[PDB]
Amino acid sequence: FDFNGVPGQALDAVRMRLAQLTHSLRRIRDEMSKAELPQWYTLQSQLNVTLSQLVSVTSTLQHFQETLDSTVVYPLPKFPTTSHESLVTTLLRKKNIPEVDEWMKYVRETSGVTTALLKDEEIEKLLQQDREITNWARTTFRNEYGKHDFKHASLLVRDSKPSKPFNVDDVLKFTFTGEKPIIT
Amino acid sequence: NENGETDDNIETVMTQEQFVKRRRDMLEHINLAMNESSLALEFVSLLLSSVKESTGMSSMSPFLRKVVKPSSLNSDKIPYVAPTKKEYIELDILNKGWKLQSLNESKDLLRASFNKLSSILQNEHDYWNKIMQSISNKDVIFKIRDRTSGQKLLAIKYGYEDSGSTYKHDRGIANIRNNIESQNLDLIPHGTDFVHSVKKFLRVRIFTKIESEDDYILSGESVMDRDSESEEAETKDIRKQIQLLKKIIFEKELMYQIKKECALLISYGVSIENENKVIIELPNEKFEIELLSLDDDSIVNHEQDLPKINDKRANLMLVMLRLLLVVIFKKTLRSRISSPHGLINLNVDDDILIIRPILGKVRFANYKLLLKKIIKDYVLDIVPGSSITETEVEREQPQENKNIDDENITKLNKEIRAFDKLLNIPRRELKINLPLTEHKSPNLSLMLESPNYCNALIHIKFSAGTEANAVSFDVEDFLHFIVAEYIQQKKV
Amino acid sequence: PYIQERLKSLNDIETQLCSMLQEASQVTFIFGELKRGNESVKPQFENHVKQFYERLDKSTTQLRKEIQLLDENVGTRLLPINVNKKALGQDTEKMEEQLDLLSAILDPSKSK
Amino acid sequence: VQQLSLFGSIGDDGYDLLISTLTTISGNPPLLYNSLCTVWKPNPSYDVENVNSRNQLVEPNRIKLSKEVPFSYLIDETMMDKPLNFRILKSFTNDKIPLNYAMTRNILHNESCSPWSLQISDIPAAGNNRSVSMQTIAETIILSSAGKNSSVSSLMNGLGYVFEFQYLTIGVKFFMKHGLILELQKIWQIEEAGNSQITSGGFLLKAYINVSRGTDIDRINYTETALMNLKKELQGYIELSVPDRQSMDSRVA
Amino acid sequence: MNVTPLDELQWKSPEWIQVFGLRTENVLDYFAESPFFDKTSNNQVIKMQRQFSQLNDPNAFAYVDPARRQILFKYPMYMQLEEELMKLDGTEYVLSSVREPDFWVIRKQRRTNNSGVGSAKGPEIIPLQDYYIIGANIYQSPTIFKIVQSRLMSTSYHLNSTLESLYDLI
Amino acid sequence: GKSAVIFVERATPATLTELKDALSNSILSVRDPWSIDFRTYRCSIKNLPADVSKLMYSITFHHHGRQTVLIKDNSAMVTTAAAADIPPALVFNGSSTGVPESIDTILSSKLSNIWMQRQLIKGDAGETLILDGLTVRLVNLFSSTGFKGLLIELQADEAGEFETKIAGIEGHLAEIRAKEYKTSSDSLGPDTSNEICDLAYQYVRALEL
Amino acid sequence: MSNQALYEKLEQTRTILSVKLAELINMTTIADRNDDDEGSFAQENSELAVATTSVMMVNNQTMQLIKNVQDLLILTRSIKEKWLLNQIPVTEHSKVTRFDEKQIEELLDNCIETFVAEKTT
């Protein structure tokens, strides 16, 4: 009633996937340090392969409320306890890119574009769409591969198996009591 | 192919600094993303507003000490519009084609080094072809793994020697292919040298010291086993390697002569210093065969051809002594095939052991010299006109050779039969003998028994007449005396 | 033995798989040119592409077939029964002992 | 004695193969053997409590006399002849060797008697899920006999037992690692009104180890393992399993 | 040519001489942030507009608030300005008033936070849509969640792919 | 092989030595000790009337092998508890597990419902006296109720005139003042294909009163 | 048995089939395919994460493809091994025994014995 219901609707949803990507990384990080022995190339792909999967769900969880969250755009106001020790606040509320943004430029400049505007750009879009349509051609060729199939029970059993000469248990029953083996 | 793909899937490497620095790269470059996923865990405290929010918050120890629920937002659904609708946003989607393009450039590059990585695996396809060629049919497909670990590491397959029946220690074979398209024969000890490195054949050697009883001059003569010193076992040829495998079998056989060495230890005939043992026997002083408690036959000598009478005999020894422990190698397997426990642990009472080299020594020496000596004592009965004869008769009475009777089974019966005819050789106690008279008729008889080169002479005698009189007695001193007493109670 | 044939059929299926790789690798670099708007080799793109599909479908039938064959070989008493690598050593060797030493003892007794 | 064991079966079809396989796994040939078992129950005319002079709850059980029959008393044809047991078993399938087995029970063909294996077994070890069948056996060897009524039948009557039923078994056994035995076997009911093969159709498979201990949990646990390894090694070729206990109880029934 | 874009530094020491101590603080921020664009300053200039008298013409019982303003509650001269700002920018409805481009603040002791906003009112609810800026020691913070995430998230992943690139180990 | 058994009913621990020395001259060698366990099983059967019999005797010898003779109504069964003494063929084809135990163990523990062990006489550290054509064994018999008496076992190779050998020893018994003693060589009737069983058996005749 | 072993291989093959397709199809989506049509259901919105799809595709698809390959080369050579495990080879002169087989050998041994051992009769 004093202060407000600010934001964070799907924030819980981000936190959960934020954590799982943290949790899978953290554990790989802990092992990463026992470089005394690497865990079994199976083991690391199990942890680093679902650890990458974790970031797909964490990647997507971001877009799903993606309209909502960049719109929310909360900047912090708090206890002045946050003001002492300072930086933690600069650090903890800061968005940037690392040395990262740079190979992002290497990549952007690696494309064939940059300052030539709208009309020529719309055209490139239609052209890339044509590439995706030529990719449908993959659908046609996949039909050719033509490999899809399956692995009456009675119909299949005659072909497969006639196994068993008798009842093991009953045979034994006889040997011990003289009770005789009845049809199985 | 699978083993080699599994090798590449073992992380395995022997790199100094090269291997070292690389793994440090993993540590730091992975750690960075681990640590930045922790900023992700800090957005968790950023919720606040709820108890479950506090739970998420404690994620930082600094949150444990930064109490506040701190932050708040408003509405710029308009700014969401700007993010989506900007000409900048249309353009940014170009950063999507751009990074994706360079990712496809990476992808292309990775894909090509892959087919060339399958090309080093074609070296292996060739190795399997090499294995397909050459040693085939009956032969070991032993599959092994070494360098420990127990999973992955280094794993491969091959055959070895001993099999049915048990010498016991250090016995097998292990085989791999070099880049010269030749197979190297490992042994899991017997240390690798393509079709061996250095080989010891069993060897033999028999000396006689006579001089017509002159100056105590001894010479030897040795039955020699040398197929050649020149070695072929051609590279790229497992057929030549099959020959090398047969050589391997011979090397395993010498290990058997080590068991015979041990079986010597039960006798009083030469074992000197515990460092060398020499096989030798008293009469005409002679020596027969050798191989040091260190070993058997190790190759390095000049080669000239002259033979000698001793030498011819000596080749007969080796085959016997060798043969005799195929017997052991056989009566071992009798028991094994036949009854539950298995045979393991070799020659208790040095009864089983002793057979090798023990009964050959005995045989030669004992029965023979003693029979000769008995014959001089029977020259003490050389006095009467008389007559007296020797048979295999003791031999005939026990230990029959290759009999139709068999044992418990058809399968069992065969092996029993195999034992029996060879069993004459192993059994070789002295047969024994007799002498007789007619005219109101008397009769006597004696048996020479070797028990392990010790000689008993047990005799009998009956003087058959209208009313019967008889005696039987079972030491050579007394035998001389018994013969003297017999002269008196004979005719004379 | 004559199975060395079936062995070589599979080792060749192995080279077929290393072709699934080698071929689709071009598919990677060639689709690189294609979305780059330069429709230059679009027919050639289609070629090496249905070719990666072709190599793996041939490998897929060939090793699938080989597995069917091995099951058939297993059904046959030609291949050893379902199970394990174990000793052949004991058999021939045990007896053969004699055959060599005996034949050689014969040889030193009379000859030529 | 403790008998740990696993059971299973193969049609005569599978025999040839199984054989070639078992020889390789064990490295010994199969060895031909047989045995007759004669089962006895307490004389139903007498009647006795289930307690001792040492107040103990003691149940009536059957006795089992077992021994070899030399094949000369068992085999139908010399033409078949040969030493090979598996090809020979097809010759034996469905129906009986000479038998009439009564004859031997009381001598014939003024007489003393043979050696027997006199046994009595208890139901296999109670167990919720056992990895292996574990059974106790009390045995003594009879060496020969003496006295007025020295036929094995007289002896058993003297002791207060009565003949119940009998069976012959012929098979091959494999001698294997750590006292492991494998029997591939066929069983024939023997009655006076003719003989029928209990195992008609195939072979009873028994893989076992008799252990001297019982009270050495370790060797017992080692033995479990051995059997397990076997079942496991042959898994996907033949399942060795634990028979139903109830089916191995020679009690009154 | 480069931009400082998604908030960066201050303007510092230059109105530290003019002196920052609340209320004056807001105006110091104006020079600093380079982010007073229309209404607050416009209000400033119009009053500031009268110079040396040329000719320049055209037309141009206490307690009542906003929900956020009621939550806030203003203490001293900035409270007076607040009245002025409402006057400057108020779309008027029956029991409601909405503002155009006013810039304003919330604070404590060493530091505060200020927003430039649009208010929509009603009897039982009222929201201001704006930009919010925090202001400690001559610096302004203006940020966005979702923008906030993309941050160390893409960073985590580029660094994980450095990690994945390092799996160039046999 | 022939045999006879003598039981000195009225005796003490010392009676043994008295006779031991009365023969101290007539000795050749003395071999290793022997032992013997003599059990009495009362049958548990009431359904069978007093018209036919009851009771079975169980005699375990330590004559190298842990062999046991059972005797009921002049019929004798021979068993072994020693694994070594098993007929080889029984073991091979699986008839035997090769794990025998004493037939008595079986009787008392498995068929205890039919048979109750009534008496258990043991003879420990017996002495083996060797003459020419007559081996003479001696031992003191103890029950769970105290000393029972002295026991003499006579085994001889010589089927020739065993009758004199027995009579002579009974003489030595008169000398040492051994009065009220019991003797058995069987009762002319049983036939021996395995004589040892019968000899071991007679004990029963000497120990039934 | 053999069946269970194969099932795995079949699954691996299916995996290998399904991922050059994802590399191709995801190529479209990676290259970014923003649609004027509202019906189309592939997304590439947010900065980092939509080009991150491109970094994940790389590692995922390319290693799943190559991995299906590595596993399938294992599969291949596994069967090869299976076949070099071998079968029970029977004897070539069985039923027709070679060498001096018989008591005949008993004679041979006696010869050697008299030969090696001394005395001249």
Curated annotation (Swiss-Prot), chain A:
The keyword Flavoprotein does not apply. Pfam families: Med8 (PF10232). Residues 1-116 are annotated as: Interaction with TBP1. GO terms for biological process: negative regulation of transcription by RNA polymerase II; positive regulation of transcription by RNA polymerase II; positive regulation of transcription elongation by RNA polymerase II; positive regulation of transcription initiation by RNA polymerase II; regulation of transcription by RNA polymerase II; RNA polymerase II preinitiation complex assembly. It is found in: Nucleus. GO terms for cellular component: core mediator complex; mediator complex; nucleus. One of its GO terms (molecular function) is protein-macromolecule adaptor activity. Residues 11-37 form a coiled coil. PANTHER family: MEDIATOR OF RNA POLYMERASE II TRANSCRIPTION SUBUNIT 8 (PTHR13074:SF9). Belongs to the Mediator complex subunit 8 family. Present with 937 molecules/cell in log phase SD medium. Component of the Mediator complex, which is composed of at least 21 subunits that form three structurally distinct submodules. The Mediator head module contains MED6, MED8, MED11, SRB4/MED17, SRB5/MED18, ROX3/MED19, SRB2/MED20 and SRB6/MED22, the middle module contains MED1, MED4, NUT1/MED5, MED7, CSE2/MED9, NUT2/MED10, SRB7/MED21 and SOH1/MED31, and the tail module contains MED2, PGD1/MED3, RGR1/MED14, GAL11/MED15 and SIN4/MED16. The head and the middle modules interact directly with RNA polymerase II, whereas the elongated tail module interacts with gene-specific regulatory proteins.
From Swiss-Prot, chain C:
Its main location: nucleus. Keywords: Activator, Coiled coil, Nucleus, Transcription, Transcription regulation. GO terms for molecular function: TFIIH-class transcription factor complex binding; transcription coactivator activity. GO terms for cellular component: core mediator complex; mediator complex; nucleus. InterPro entries: Mediator_Med11. Residues 53-104 form a coiled coil. Pfam families: Med11. The keyword Secreted does not apply. GO terms for biological process: negative regulation of transcription by RNA polymerase II; positive regulation of transcription by RNA polymerase II; positive regulation of transcription elongation by RNA polymerase II; positive regulation of transcription initiation by RNA polymerase II; RNA polymerase II preinitiation complex assembly. It is found in: Nucleus. Component of the Mediator complex, a coactivator involved in the regulated transcription of nearly all RNA polymerase II-dependent genes. Mediator functions as a bridge to convey information from gene-specific regulatory proteins to the basal RNA polymerase II transcription machinery. The Mediator complex, having a compact conformation in its free form, is recruited to promoters by direct interactions with regulatory proteins and serves for the assembly of a functional pre-initiation complex (PIC) with RNA polymerase II and the general transcription factors. Present with 396 molecules/cell in log phase SD medium. Belongs to the mediator complex subunit 11 family. The gene is MED11.
UniProtKB/Swiss-Prot annotation, chain D:
Signal peptide: none annotated. InterPro entries: Mediator_Med18. Component of the Mediator complex, which is composed of at least 21 subunits that form three structurally distinct submodules. The Mediator head module contains MED6, MED8, MED11, SRB4/MED17, SRB5/MED18, ROX3/MED19, SRB2/MED20 and SRB6/MED22, the middle module contains MED1, MED4, NUT1/MED5, MED7, CSE2/MED9, NUT2/MED10, SRB7/MED21 and SOH1/MED31, and the tail module contains MED2, PGD1/MED3, RGR1/MED14, GAL11/MED15 and SIN4/MED16. The head and the middle modules interact directly with RNA polymerase II, whereas the elongated tail module interacts with gene-specific regulatory proteins. One of its GO terms (cellular component) is mediator complex. The keyword Lipid biosynthesis does not apply. Transmembrane segments: none annotated. The gene is SRB5. Component of the Mediator complex, a coactivator involved in the regulated transcription of nearly all RNA polymerase II-dependent genes. Mediator functions as a bridge to convey information from gene-specific regulatory proteins to the basal RNA polymerase II transcription machinery. The Mediator complex, having a compact conformation in its free form, is recruited to promoters by direct interactions with regulatory proteins and serves for the assembly of a functional preinitiation complex with RNA polymerase II and the general transcription factors. This is Mediator of RNA polymerase II transcription subunit 18.
Swiss-Prot record, chain E:
Keywords: Activator, Nucleus, Phosphoprotein, Transcription, Transcription regulation. Its main location: nucleus. One of its GO terms (biological process) is positive regulation of transcription initiation by RNA polymerase II. Component of the Mediator complex, a coactivator involved in the regulated transcription of nearly all RNA polymerase II-dependent genes. Mediator functions as a bridge to convey information from gene-specific regulatory proteins to the basal RNA polymerase II transcription machinery. The Mediator complex, having a compact conformation in its free form, is recruited to promoters by direct interactions with regulatory proteins and serves for the assembly of a functional preinitiation complex with RNA polymerase II and the general transcription factors. The gene is MED6. Belongs to the Mediator complex subunit 6 family. The keyword DNA damage does not apply. It comes from Saccharomyces cerevisiae (strain ATCC 204508 / S288c). This is Mediator of RNA polymerase II transcription subunit 6. It is found in: Nucleus. Signal peptide: none annotated. GO terms for cellular component: core mediator complex; mediator complex; nucleus. GO terms for molecular function: transcription coactivator activity. Present with 4824 molecules/cell in log phase SD medium. The chain holds residues 1 to 192 of 295 of the full protein. It comes from the Eukaryota.
